[PDB]
Enzyme design. Structure first.
Site, short mmCIF file in Angstrom:
data_model
loop_
_atom_site.label_atom_id
_atom_site.label_comp_id
_atom_site.label_asym_id
_atom_site.label_seq_id
_atom_site.Cartn_x
_atom_site.Cartn_y
_atom_site.Cartn_z
N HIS A 278 -8.10 34.70 -24.41
CA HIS A 278 -8.68 34.31 -23.11
C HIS A 278 -9.93 33.46 -23.32
CE1 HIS A 278 -10.95 34.61 -19.29
NE2 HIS A 278 -9.82 34.92 -18.68
N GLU B 21 -9.97 29.43 -22.36
CA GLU B 21 -10.86 29.00 -21.28
C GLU B 21 -11.89 27.98 -21.76
OE1 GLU B 21 -10.50 29.45 -18.05
OE2 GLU B 21 -8.78 30.73 -18.30
N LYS C 116 -10.08 24.51 -22.23
CA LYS C 116 -9.91 23.91 -20.89
C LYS C 116 -11.17 23.21 -20.37
CE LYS C 116 -7.89 27.53 -18.91
NZ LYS C 116 -7.56 28.20 -17.64
N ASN C 117 -12.31 23.90 -20.50
CA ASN C 117 -13.63 23.39 -20.18
C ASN C 117 -14.05 22.19 -21.03
OD1 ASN C 117 -16.52 23.75 -18.90
ND2 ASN C 117 -16.93 24.02 -21.12
#
Ligand SMILES: [K+]
Ligand SMILES: [K+]
Lengths: 365, 365
Positions: free
Chosen positions: B219, B223, B226-227
């Protein structure tokens, strides 16, 4: 009473100035007098109330007693002017003299307060040591602020004082590097090279300048270089091959950032904050009677005070390290003089409660 | 009363477990039952008292009312076992069934609570919004903890549960990269490449493994990718040349660190914390009725929840960005299972005061 003078002025809050406001002062000696004859007693008095809240065994040290006596003498001299006529030309001459007098006398407060902390640890607590950390950030920040006002007034009425409206950032960085490097060569008989990269995002390929106090920027980069160098030389000691210190400077819309990167082996996250802790950073003062090179870490609170310089004008100084590899240290400075506002401690009920009080809302590990 | 059950159990503190303790459980279904029949009601009840302190207009939303009703139903089902015999084989079968039941039913709480925050912003404050931030960190951390216990018990009695004693860190990272990259390709029609570097300082050139929950690590890295990707694609959009995302993994004595570095143009220091702010990060939920690619930022609280995953076992997740240049995101994980202790919120007087209270000791800018 002298406690009475302190209590009266400590009721007032310090009045923070912007970098733009400092810069407008340098454009009228009378307008400074009216400001400083109130502001200086207020700033002195606010911090003096906190000195009084120190652990008795810290307060009572010879060094802290000396520093307190200097603050007391300074207050009394400035409060000699409280009524003395604003229109009087002798009084303003005498004020600019008193300010010049106070400035050019006590350059020694920072190591002297640090000696007091040594005297304290030497002859004598975890509860009160949180108080010591809280106080020293406030005391040294207050000191930066008071010195700023003394320096501006003495320079203008004795480059806009100590402010350079066009501070050449890379020039300051290179001066910081060379001075650190000389000390590194002296202690380790070798030193890392510098690799310097710059990006003016604001205006690409143009020189990076900001309105700033050059000596503040210098203190910060010089102290960070010393720290990066020590880590590097001590980590790679066996190999005899020492990785460069890499510095990246960026001017953005809002932030000037100086990133300093070392391959000195890092510190785990549990420990990294100790570098900003006064009681932990209280190292032996180098002795006069030796030709042996001065170590790059130790006495003097270089890193915590560097961070106070960053934060004084709404900047910051952050460290993040990767244990086993290396460390990045980042200076954040406001790019705009109008965002650059003094960060000032104030004595009131909230400040007093901090000394007399103490995360129950989370389970402990 | 149901308020009474909640009040009774909320008096107790949650009991945090180490990663080593979780690992010792997987070696006796009866010993888990005795633990969980108290621990689960305590954890549920502590967080339920805080739900009740939410702003009325948040509490009253359909989504938060749904989530609260699930917590209420769950508590009541676990409290059906409080006396039921520890020696009884049917009761422990029924417990493992109730735990399995509760686990496999409410996978949806995180986006549902996030919908409640949307419903709240949509129909309706800066004072209470500090309360919302405080609550949601605590609620989502509590949720991670409760899910951990449900997952371990359901996996063992329904790789040591969800713990892998030998989590291959780079493998997880590469899976996170590829999954983020597929989404990046979908939205931007291009994506940055990965450059992956590793250092096992602990044992040089050996694979980097730790005792960890792989899906937690996943996770976090997914994440962060993606950022990093969104920042990169949006910054360099004109050039059509997209700098790689660089990841450096280090195993030290105490810290496993994953540094993720992008050249996506950064964010000034004033703003960077908004990425962890629920009320600011409350973006529109992607609509079902479209073939248009899902954006890499938005709904779902990816970054704040990633950070909660890091901090759950005494790690951390920090961002530092250089405005105009790029951003480093750093995951800190404890290298040693014995340092890996659950970080758990507790309801008491201190927690209640946080909702009903509120730095006067510094001058404001
Ligand atoms: K005051
Ligand atoms: K409690």
């Amino acid at each position: 009473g002298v406690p009475g003078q302190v209590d009266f002025y400590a009721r007032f809050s310090p009045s923070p100035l912007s970098m733009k406001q400092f810069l407008d002062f340098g454009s009228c000696e009378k307008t400074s007098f009216m400001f400083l004859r109130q502001e200086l007693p207020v700033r002195l008095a606010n911090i003096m109330k906190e000195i009084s809240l120190l652990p008795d065994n810290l307060l009572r040290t010879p060094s802290v007693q000396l520093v307190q006596s200097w603050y007391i003498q300074s207050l009394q001299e400035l409060l000699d002017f409280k009524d003395k006529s604003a229109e009087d030309a002798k009084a303003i001459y005498d004020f600019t003299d008193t300010v010049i007098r106070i400035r050019n006398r006590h350059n020694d407060v920072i190591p002297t307060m640090a000696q007091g902390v040594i005297e304290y640890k030497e002859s004598f607590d975890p509860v009160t040591s949180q108080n010591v950390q809280y106080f020293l950030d406030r005391f040294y920040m207050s000191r930066i602020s008071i010195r700023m006002l003394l320096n501006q007034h003495s320079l203008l009425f004795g480059h806009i004082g100590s402010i350079n409206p066009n501070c050449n950032v890379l020039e300051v960085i290179k001066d910081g590097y060379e001075n650190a490097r000389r000390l590194c060569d002296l202690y380790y008989i070798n030193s890392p090279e510098l690799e310097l990269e710059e990006l003016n995002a604001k205006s690409p390929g143009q020189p990076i300048q900001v309105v700033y106090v050059p000596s503040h920027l210098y203190h910060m980069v010089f102290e960070l270089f010393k720290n990066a160098m020590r880590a590097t030389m001590e980590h790679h000691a066996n190999r005899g091959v020492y990785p460069p210190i890499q510095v990246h400077v960026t001017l953005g819309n809002e932030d000037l950032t100086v990133k300093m990167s070392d391959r000195g082996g890092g510190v785990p996250l549990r420990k990294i904050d100790r570098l900003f802790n006064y009681m932990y950073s209280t190292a032996p003062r180098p002795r006069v009677e030796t030709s042996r090179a001065v170590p790059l870490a130790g006495f003097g609170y270089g890193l915590p005070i560097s961070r106070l310089y960053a934060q004084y004008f709404q900047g910051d100084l952050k460290l993040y390290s990767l244990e086993g590899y290396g460390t990045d240290a980042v200076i954040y400075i406001k790019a705009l003089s109008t965002d650059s506002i003094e960060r000032l401690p104030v004595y009131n009920k909230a400040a007093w409660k901090h000394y007399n009080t103490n995360a129950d809302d989370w389970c402990v590990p």
